[PDB]
Amino acid sequence: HHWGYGKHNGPEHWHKDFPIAKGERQSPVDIDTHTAKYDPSLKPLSVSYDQATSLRILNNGHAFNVEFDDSQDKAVLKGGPLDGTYRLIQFHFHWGSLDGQGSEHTVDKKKYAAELHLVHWNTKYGDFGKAVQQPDGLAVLGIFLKVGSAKPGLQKVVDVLDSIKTKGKSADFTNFDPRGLLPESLDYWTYPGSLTTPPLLECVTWIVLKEPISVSSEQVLKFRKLNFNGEGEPEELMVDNWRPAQPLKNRQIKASFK
Ligand SMILES: CCc1cc2c(cc1OS(N)(=O)=O)CC[C@@H]1[C@@H]2CC[C@]2(C)C(=O)CC[C@@H]12
Numbered sequence: 001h002h003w004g005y006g007k008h009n010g011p012e013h014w015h016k017d018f019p020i021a022k023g024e025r026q027s028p029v030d031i032d033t034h035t036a037k038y039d040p041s042l043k044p045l046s047v048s049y050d051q052a053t054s055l056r057i058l059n060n061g062h063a064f065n066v067e068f069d070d071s072q073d074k075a076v077l078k079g080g081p082l083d084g085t086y087r088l089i090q091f092h093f094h095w096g097s098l099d100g101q102g103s104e105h106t107v108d109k110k111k112y113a114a115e116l117h118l119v120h121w122n123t124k125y126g127d128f129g130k131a132v133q134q135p136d137g138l139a140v141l142g143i144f145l146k147v148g149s150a151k152p153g154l155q156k157v158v159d160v161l162d163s164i165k166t167k168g169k170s171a172d173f174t175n176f177d178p179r180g181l182l183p184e185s186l187d188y189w190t191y192p193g194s195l196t197t198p199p200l201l202e203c204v205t206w207i208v209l210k211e212p213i214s215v216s217s218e219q220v221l222k223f224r225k226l227n228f229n230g231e232g233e234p235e236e237l238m239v240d241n242w243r244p245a246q247p248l249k250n251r252q253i254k255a256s257f258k
Pocket residue numbers: 117119129132138140194195196197198199200201
């Protein structure tokens with residue numbers, strides 16, 4: 001009986017196995033745009049993905065991860081609120097059963113259809129497992145998805161999902177360019193938080209872009225055909241794999257823009 005997103009093992013249950021679920025810097029949160037404060041002194045984001053090397057895509061039973069070679073400085077995030085260099089290790093999404101929900105962060109209580117997380121770890125900690133044990137170990141770039149026009153750069157991801165329908169399936173996924181998933185503007189909000197899935201470690205500097213990307217109804221429909229279960233187990237569609245907004249507590253959200 002492990003954690004998930006169902007009635008009996010979903011977000012309201014997680015605190016029993018992971019008491020940090022009720023901690024002081026949990027994610028996601030609602031971004032109150034009127035209360036967020038512009039922080040001149042915030043630097044422009046630097047997103048350097050030209051040499052990114054994707055390797056594989058994996059259905060891990062909670063989402064699908066597109067994984068990257070992070071054994072060298074090839075795709076890095078720097079600047080913004082960050083000190084030092086953070087290396088891209090994987091991206092994944094959270095999405096809903098309906099276009100009206102699916103994002104983890106909300107904006108003035110608005111839910112988007114999905115949310116992309118580009119996960120990076122601070123290279124001063126040597127690798128990902130060590131980084132998640134540090135308060136400044138990770139930087140996650142969050143990007144909202146709304147339903148409208150297709151995102152051409154997402155299609156290669158959508159088209160491989162049939163090969164990783166169920167938990168534990170993986171497929172080769174080389175030469176995928178994550179630059180094709182970014183909006184025009186890098187204006188962002190930032191705050192200190194956590195992983196949004198167990199173990200919910202408080203190791204993340206969140207950087208959430210203001211500008212959503214648009215994806216087509218057909219693209220998100222294909223996300224919803226994935227399964228949480230393994231092959232040969234009862235089929236349960238992988239939908240609504242999002243944690244709701246958590247209390248902001250003693251935190252201030254900063255904006256890079258006015
Ligand atoms: C940040 C990417 C991200 C990473 C992780 C999880 C969930 C994530 O999604 S999100 N929504 O970005 O927070 C949950 C499992 C975590 C793992 C970090 C490494 C951990 C702790 C281990 O060594 C064993 C348990 C592993």
